Symmetry: C3
Subunit: 56 residues, 3 copies
């Protein structure tokens, strides 16, 4: 059982130019609207998140 | 404040035979269905994911 | 295109005492309630998780 991780970008614009480099099974975070995805074998799945709050 | 990470397996079958060894607080990726779980102290929680798309829109 | 990770705390209160040290884009696991959050700039988004089960369902 291998390991992956989480890759980060500040903006969607920057992410879209580089996301092809992300290996399968890694997570992808885009800071501007606090979005999270996971990379699949042949696509992407968006993680479902509740609304942003200052506290948990 | 310690760190965990993400563990991955290619198939559900492969995962189910080894996943008990994953420590609490790690994420678990199963490539076959492109699914994610979180390891709890006593069990697992499945992450809700939207359907697969070609790009992260 | 940097990298982040996952960090672990036992409780919401323990986490909150350290959260200023957590940058945006890190995932946060809280063992009490087996909950997962993502750090945003100035806050958190809770990951939607299904119910805890003994096996990955």
């Amino acid at each position: 059982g291998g390991s992956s991780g989480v890759r980060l970008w500040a903006t969607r614009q920057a992410m879209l130019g580089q996301v092809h480099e992300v290996p399968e099974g890694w997570l992808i975070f885009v800071a501007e609207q606090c979005e999270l995805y996971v990379r699949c074998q042949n696509g992407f799945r968006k993680v479902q998140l509740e609304a942003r709050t200052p506290l948990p």
